[PDB]
């Protein structure tokens, strides 16, 4: 077990995920020029240590080796302690909350390399229902959008739009 970055945080929140098998990073700058380097998106995911479903998708999808190892083909993927950032918690609510009309935790949010938002979620659990995407359906088809209808997704994070949060609800 090698541990990702998240090793040397202070936070037990965050250290906690410093051997999930998710490459994560903690909120900086050398994860957004990893970003913009790879030209990848990133997935940000905020929470916090008494949030029973942001345990849940630990325990669910983030611990898990598959749905890890596509976040780390499709993504440079950032964990966020809303104790000790509540401005940025603050910040991607308020994003959750225009794109999908409501908001909770674990906020998980996909933006591009300069930060501009086009997907949220709140829980997302690994496997697809009814109405309702799992996190192994979702990460290939936001990594498929990204390369082939790129420029769709700059429009939409411009313009802070539901283009790409509505595809992939179509995605079905």
């Known amino acids: 077990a090698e541990p990702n970055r998240l090793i040397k945080e202070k936070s037990p929140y965050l250290l906690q995920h410093a051997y999930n098998p998710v490459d994560w990073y903690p909120w900086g700058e050398e994860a957004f020029e990893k970003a913009r380097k790879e030209n990848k998106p990133v997935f940000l995911s905020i929470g916090y240590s008494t949030c029973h479903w942001c345990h849940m998708m630990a325990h669910e999808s983030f611990e898990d080796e598959e749905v890890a190892g596509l976040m780390n083909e499709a993504f440079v993927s950032i964990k966020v302690d809303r104790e000790e950032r509540?401005?940025?918690?603050?910040?991607?609510?308020?994003?959750?909350?225009?794109?999908?009309?409501?908001?909770?935790?674990?906020?998980?949010?996909?933006?591009?390399?300069?930060?501009?938002?086009?997907?949220?979620?709140?829980?997302?659990?690994k496997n697809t229902r009814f109405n309702q995407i799992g996190m192994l359906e979702l990460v290939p088809r936001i990594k498929e959008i990204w390369e082939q209808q790129h420029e769709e997704v700059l429009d939409s994070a411009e313009k802070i739009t539901s283009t790409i949060q509505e595809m992939i609800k179509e995605s079905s």
């Open 86 to 125: 509540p401005d940025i918690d603050n910040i991607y609510m308020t994003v959750c909350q225009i794109i999908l009309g409501r908001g909770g935790w674990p906020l998980n949010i996909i933006m591009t390399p300069g930060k501009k938002p086009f997907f949220a979620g709140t829980y997302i659990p």
